[PDB]
């Protein structure tokens, strides 16, 4: 059993390496196979898995015909989170009955999510007095407000969306809780074109540098 | 006892490996590298899967591969093969999936809906450009050209359909022209073909 144990350990190390290569750990797998000939064979694979921060369950029944393969059906369960768009995207992929694009989209969504949460934690750590946790580091939006003067506030909203083909893309927009007192004070009125300008600035020099410069201007 | 537990662990990890094969991509570690298997599918239709050999040594080299050459990878290799290998694999997976979907749409059209087609379709190996002609039954002739210049997606960005030899006489004809334009620009090919033909 020693040689078998060593071979199993080597295979387990290989499986862990591949799991790191995909970023997804499949906890369980149950296989069933039936044959229905007039040679059609239906195979059902139940599996629970998880990405870095997320856990999922899914089962799918696929058909193989004597030399084509196509998934007959599938069901899939997420966990309840704020990002309800993930659930509707899961549903849409369920009608699409597509797996590879679904998993790549989920990994990309978590990769952007981890990036967003890490950036939020870093900016909160940098300046913890001008950074307010409106809903949390794992939320969609952040808000910077001056403690001495609560009239101003600036909220950056970040939402990750999925294209119909399966492409993923983030989106960031600004909004200012600004009194008309300050608007009356200065007649320059550049806040009208603020969203597009800030988007261009972020595209020029990223998100973290943009927010760092923004909070530097708030000194 | 111990043998039974070892067998149970082995069959569990084998089932997990099969599940890993059934999703995303596959990889089988070897002595000289990993013969990484990439899987392709579209609209719940399993498609042909490829594989590429790897060398784990620092001078990263591809000593063997099965991906067709017309798919650009050497530029992507210079881009992200040395650095951020994960993005390299994700991008190549997307590109192969898009190519497989395009080829599946093309040969599905050739095999199934050739009934209303009046001529062979001209297709590139990468299937970025498609040019064909079709008759729909009143009977109207059309000739369509699709530009899949966005390589990462399976949907064209610019499509143009027209006819030569007939002068415009019915606004309804231009209406079906625009409808087909939108159908190619938005929805898959065989799907909209089965949609209007039926």
């Amino acid at each position: 059993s020693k040689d078998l144990k060593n071979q199993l350990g080597h295979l387990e190390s290989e499986l862990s390496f591949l799991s790191t290569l995909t970023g997804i750990n499949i906890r369980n797998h149950s296989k069933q196979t039936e044959d229905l000939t007039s040679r059609k064979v239906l195979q059902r694979h139940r599996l629970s898995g998880n990405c870095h921060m997320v856990t999922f369950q899914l089962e799918f029944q696929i058909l193989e015909i004597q030399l084509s393969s196509a998934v007959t059906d599938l069901n899939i369960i997420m966990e309840p989170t704020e990002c309800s768009e993930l659930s509707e995207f899961v549903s849409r992929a369920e009608e699409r009955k597509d797996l590879f694009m679904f998993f790549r989209s989920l990994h990309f969504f978590v990769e952007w999510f981890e990036y967003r949460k890490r950036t939020f934690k870093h900016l909160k750590e940098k300046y913890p007095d001008a950074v307010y946790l409106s809903e949390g580091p794992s939320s969609c939006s952040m808000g910077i407000r001056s403690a001495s003067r609560p009239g101003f506030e600036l909220v950056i909203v970040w939402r990750i969306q999925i294209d119909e083909d399966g492409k993923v893309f983030p989106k960031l927009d600004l909004l200012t809780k600004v009194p008309q007192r300050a608007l009356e004070l200065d007649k320059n009125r550049a806040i009208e074109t603020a969203p597009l300008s800030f988007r261009t600035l972020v595209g020029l020099l990223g998100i973290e540098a943009a927010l760092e410069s923004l909070i530097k201007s708030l000194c | 006892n111990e043998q039974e537990a070892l067998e149970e662990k082995l069959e569990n990890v084998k089932a997990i490996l099969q599940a890993y094969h059934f999703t995303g991509l596959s990889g089988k570690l070897t002595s000289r590298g990993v013969c990484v298997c990439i899987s392709t599918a579209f609209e719940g239709n399993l498609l042909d899967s490829y594989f590429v050999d790897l060398v784990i040594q620092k001078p990263l080299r591809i000593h063997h591969h099965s991906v067709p050459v017309f798919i650009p990878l050497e530029e992507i290799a210079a881009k992200y093969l040395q650095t951020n290998i994960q993005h390299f694999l994700f991008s190549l997976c997307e590109y192969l999936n898009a190519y497989s979907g395009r080829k599946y749409q093309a040969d599905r059209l050739q095999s199934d809906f050739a009934a209303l087609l009046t001529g062979p379709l001209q297709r590139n190996p990468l299937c970025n450009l498609l040019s064909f002609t079709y008759k729909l039954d009143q009977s109207f002739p059309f000739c369509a050209r699709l530009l899949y210049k966005d390589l990462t997606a399976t949907l064209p960005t610019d499509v143009t359909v027209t006819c030569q030899g007939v002068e415009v006489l019915s606004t309804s004809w231009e209406e079906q022209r625009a409808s087909h334009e939108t159908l190619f620009c938005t929805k898959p090919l065989h799907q909209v073909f089965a949609s209007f033909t039926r």
Binding site: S16 | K58, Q82, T83, I85, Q86
Partner: peptide
């Protein structure tokens, strides 16, 4: 980098 990540996970 990629090499350092691969070596850190291989160990």
């Amino acid at each position: 980098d990629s090499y350092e990540f691969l070596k850190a996970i291989l160990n």
